Amino acid sequence: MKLSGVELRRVQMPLVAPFRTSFGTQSVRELLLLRAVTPAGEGWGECVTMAGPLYSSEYNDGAEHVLRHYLIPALLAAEDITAAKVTPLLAKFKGHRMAKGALEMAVLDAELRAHERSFAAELGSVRDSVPCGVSVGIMDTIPQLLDVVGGYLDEGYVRIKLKIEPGWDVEPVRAVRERFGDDVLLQVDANTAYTLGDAPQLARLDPFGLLLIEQPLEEEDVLGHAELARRIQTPICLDESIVSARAAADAIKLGAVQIVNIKPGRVGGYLEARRVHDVCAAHGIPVWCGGMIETGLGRAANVALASLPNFTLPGDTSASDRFYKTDITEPFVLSGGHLPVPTGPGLGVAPIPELLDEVTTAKVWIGS
Amino acid sequence: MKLSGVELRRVQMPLVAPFRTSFGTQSVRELLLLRAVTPAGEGWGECVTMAGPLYSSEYNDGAEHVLRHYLIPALLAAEDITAAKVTPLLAKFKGHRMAKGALEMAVLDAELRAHERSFAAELGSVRDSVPCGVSVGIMDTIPQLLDVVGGYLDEGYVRIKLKIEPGWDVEPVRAVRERFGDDVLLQVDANTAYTLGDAPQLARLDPFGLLLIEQPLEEEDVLGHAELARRIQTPICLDESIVSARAAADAIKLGAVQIVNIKPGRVGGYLEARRVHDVCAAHGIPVWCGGMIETGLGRAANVALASLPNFTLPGDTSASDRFYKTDITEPFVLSGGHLPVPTGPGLGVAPIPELLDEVTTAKVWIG
Amino acid sequence: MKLSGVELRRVQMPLVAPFRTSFGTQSVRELLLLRAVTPAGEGWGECVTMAGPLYSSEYNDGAEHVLRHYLIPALLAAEDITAAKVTPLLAKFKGHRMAKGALEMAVLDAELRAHERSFAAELGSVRDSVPCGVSVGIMDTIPQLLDVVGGYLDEGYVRIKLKIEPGWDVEPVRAVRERFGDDVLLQVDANTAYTLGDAPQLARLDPFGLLLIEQPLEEEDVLGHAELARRIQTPICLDESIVSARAAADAIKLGAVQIVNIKPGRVGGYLEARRVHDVCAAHGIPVWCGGMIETGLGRAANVALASLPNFTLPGDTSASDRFYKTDITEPFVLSGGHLPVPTGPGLGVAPIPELLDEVTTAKVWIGS
Amino acid sequence: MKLSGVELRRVQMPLVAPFRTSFGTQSVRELLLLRAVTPAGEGWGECVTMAGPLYSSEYNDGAEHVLRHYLIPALLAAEDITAAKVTPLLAKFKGHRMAKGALEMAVLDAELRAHERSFAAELGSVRDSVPCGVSVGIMDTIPQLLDVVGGYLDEGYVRIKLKIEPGWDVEPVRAVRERFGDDVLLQVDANTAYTLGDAPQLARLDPFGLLLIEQPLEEEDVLGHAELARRIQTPICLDESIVSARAAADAIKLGAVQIVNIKPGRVGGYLEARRVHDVCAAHGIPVWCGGMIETGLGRAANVALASLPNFTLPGDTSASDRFYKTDITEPFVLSGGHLPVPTGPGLGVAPIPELLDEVTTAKVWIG
């Protein structure tokens, strides 16, 4: 393939309900889409960055810039372009995983669409549908939470991920275990909220029988996690720390993680994503698909990813309507708590421009 | 896709020159080829097994029987088929990786050709050509050896690999180093011929600056290699022991290997080969493509695979003529120590029927 | 003395009751038997492969070929043969342990008969009778399972082993523990049915006081076993993975195993099996004798084997009638939960021609 | 098999040339023989103890004693006797392995003869002859030593083993290596004469290419061996320390040994000895048969043992004359640096009564 150009868009989709994390509350999502233009056709790219640098150092505007000025050009200046080759191409640029991911993603979609292959196919899906769970935010109250949860449970969600933070741990958890029962798939996420010194606190959850605890400490603190693993009964799950397959290997080898959360953007692309899956698999480490509150575009790729064999745990692959009233693509609909893997070439999904333009906030064509 | 059937062929191909390993000599090559038949088109697969169970427990007749009786049938029974699904589909049958690998290859070639996609595209290549090394057998004489080596050297072969045995280690090595120099890319392959007890003789090779020692010990002896690794300077490379990505991971983790030889058939498929590649990469373990004296069919797909990013060492991807006077597909020709990655869909090669039919001993339809 | 030839027979025996494991259901047993002919007399070997390659890579058809085309020929080609020399003589041929074990059995029996020695004497028996447990397959219902178990228990079997699988683990265990009590010897066997990710589930059996959990993971997954063991309270026991005494040593050193199941055909013969017994013993790893639904031939060699000092756990050495209404040799009958070690030369048993001829489907003579 | 009784004989044999070790000098060999008697026939046992408790805590008189009062009686009292059962029957008595080993032997010889089976068959011999080495004692002179060595090498011996002592280590070696060459298989044996604190000293032998260094430290000091292995290049070999298969496994596990010397009575019997072999083998640890200056009886059993598969190093299984002009049995005669594995039943050898009588000193019958 030959890269024709990339149209960058800024989108702004308003969340159904504000989603509060250890890093801040969210009322509206500010995304960053990519339209890759080839000889053949075009591909879509979705950047998991957010307004500001609060989950990671990467943020919407930073991405634009790097993309614009560094990334996109690099590829454009290439003869042959293969999503594979994208990586090596961009190698001289340190970091910006979410940005290259999105880029790669756009390219990939084009290529698969040209060979008429689905994402899944490329990634080697074996499954047709995927079990979905949901990620529940920090409530201002119990009942509030108890309610939502029950709500989600009702719609068919198989598992529950509770957002935690100091002061929002044990209680919430205790309360949900209590109401809903013990046969409920339950896990927590601290989005780096704690410290090794908070061990005892997190030790407090031991009793609850959670599947795992996601990123209790900083992104850089692998050893801390391994130590931590030593002090608590809850299986460590790493997110933030998993920036690559190598990273996953390292953390595993160090006994710092038992289950890994896969976020295609975080790791720099669906391809790396696949590798992390592989790596994990080879080490007998279950993996699961993580969510960045994406559109039907990220959601579709995820769903395909998530249908890979080692995804033995329900991912954060919730129905479109969990966050968005109006998706810019055919929405995703829970069905017996599952989501159907997209059968058509590339993502097997595309945006509906009215929907699209209504949400678009800006645009920019980057070309040769 | 939908599997319509598979045509099993037996092929015999005479060697240009007898090929001697620690497991024996070989003047001819019996192979097993597979023709996958879909409503859409064809796909070809090559089996790496040989006449008897000498390199591994797998053998031609053995593969044939399982394919026939178990493997082909289980795929045909499946509604929709994807190379990817092959695995899960044949998972109930334990072992039989070479066979399973051939079939998946057949399936995959079809599937890709259908998506108008190359093996190399699917596998994730980053290059267009690959540097080839050569596997030099055991000689009767040192001079004999030296001519031979020199021979390849002139052909443009990028790296030299010497088959060693007990009684054919150090000297042969001493010889090539001395005669040919310190800058030659040299490594040995014991095809499991040694024991942990022979360490000292192996340590005797420390001085020659070999890139590696390939499978000094038995297939099952991983911790032994790790121990060995602590007794010699020469880096350990595994072939036989690497039956899967998990095998790789295990070995790495245990300190039993530093470099991995990837033999797709051996690991049960090109897809698994990929995974091994990735696994090795993630651990900082260089890989290189191994060879099983295959036809241009296997040769084609291996060149593809040998173009992957982690293949940081010349693999056993010599040119067709190194073994075969006449290949069943368009030959592979060394152009400046390299080989060109195929560009057509699927394998990018196909047997020249005229040529095939000349080397086919048997045939059978499974549909 | 010097191999004259071997007769290969195909035998088919119906099971009094269908047997189900995690790999499938079985109503009839297909075996491979060998009559080794020596100037000094004949010997009988039994191969443990089955129809298809489901417990392992080996299977009847495969064994037969390899024997016929490689192994037998190779022994024929020798000047001298001893059971002990069988290994070295066949070493050039990778794998095919079951086939090899069968051939070595045949040679060894012929040899022991000539010397008028018994298998037990040869192996080092120190006991004249052995405690027998029973292997219970997967049932359609619990109640069903409860009865069966009930019955064996009644027959005087010393321990119960339950075939498990995901979806048939905790309940059945709970039901039996609950119905029969805590004093019974109880263990389970997954036949590689689980993954490392299944630890939490398995960890659920903890409470039942199981003697062990046999081969929860795949054959090649030794490290996982050591990991798993760190995760569960039930002791790990390996079957499929123990393919040799070296295999055993490695697994022991890795902490992957605590109790070893010895299966002669699996490890390449009675001779190898002894080494395994010996290696374990030296590492303080208790062993027990595995079963492969053998006829009186293998049954008898097994009873002998299991009288060895390190076999401190009841084995899968049930009475003939557990599987066969009519055995081809003198039947094995339970007495006070024990089976008597055979005293004659060689196996101490032999087939009853008319009986054997009846189950024979094919026969071939392999000579020079 | 029911044990009728045993005849204990004290035997005194003169050594052709005095034998010096770290623990002393030996001019004359005082053995202890047993004649087991059963309804069917007889079997012979040879005890490796010596006059005093210098190699180990066991000595001729303490052996006789335990045998008389404890061991023997124990076997008489049982209905069914079998070699294998000797262990379990004598297990309540702590230690006294060489003594228990002796009994076991005679019983086994009797048991094997009864079935017309050789010790070799029983043990699992894979070989018909075995490569022999020789153990050379401490000399008074370096030259007197080179002479002796050259003599043994001349006889056709396959390996040289040097007894060493602080004050007789490097020089001796240096000497032999200088004179005889680097191609000779050379090794040394300290008989526990050094301490961890002597490391530097022993490290002094690294340059020499010794195959191994036998029991440098005391019997009970496994850990120190492991440590010492760390500080010297010479491979550690354990003798005294290997009192059993479990002992071997422990030492192996702790890295205190790379090569194991197997001495049947030291470990309490040929049966145990077999396990030891097996255990080592399973850990990739080579073994070799050690010697106790035995008559043709033990010599015979040792030769059979030494033909096992993992005995990949020549043993101290020298020809009969190395110590005795007149062996109480048909003498062992080196041939092509080898000794032939006995073919008869049991030992496949027996004492020449006449001969045996000359050298007998005492004799008691226990029934």
Ligand SMILES: CSCC[C@@H](NC(=O)CCC(=O)O)C(=O)O
């Ligand atoms: C608000 S973005 C935080 C990312 C958080 N994501 C979710 O909790 C999942 C939200 C979703 O379903 O996309 C995580 O730690 O993985």
Ligand SMILES: CSCC[C@@H](NC(=O)CCC(=O)O)C(=O)O
């Ligand atoms: C003797 S058959 C193959 C065994 C050997 N293979 C080769 O040496 C490569 C030969 C080739 O180029 O195909 C190996 O161990 O890798």
Ligand SMILES: CSCC[C@@H](NC(=O)CCC(=O)O)C(=O)O
């Ligand atoms: C054909 S499946 C038999 C394998 C199985 N063996 C048994 O279950 C015991 C049968 C017996 O008692 O012989 C095991 O995995 O341990």
Ligand SMILES: CSCC[C@@H](NC(=O)CCC(=O)O)C(=O)O
């Ligand atoms: C005689 S006690 C000293 C034993 C010495 N043995 C020999 O050197 C072997 C002599 C022999 O029996 O051939 C040793 O400790 O290894």
Ligand SMILES: [Mg+2]
């Ligand atoms: Mg998270």
Ligand SMILES: [Mg+2]
């Ligand atoms: Mg190789």
Ligand SMILES: [Mg+2]
């Ligand atoms: Mg089992």
Ligand SMILES: [Mg+2]
């Ligand atoms: Mg010694």
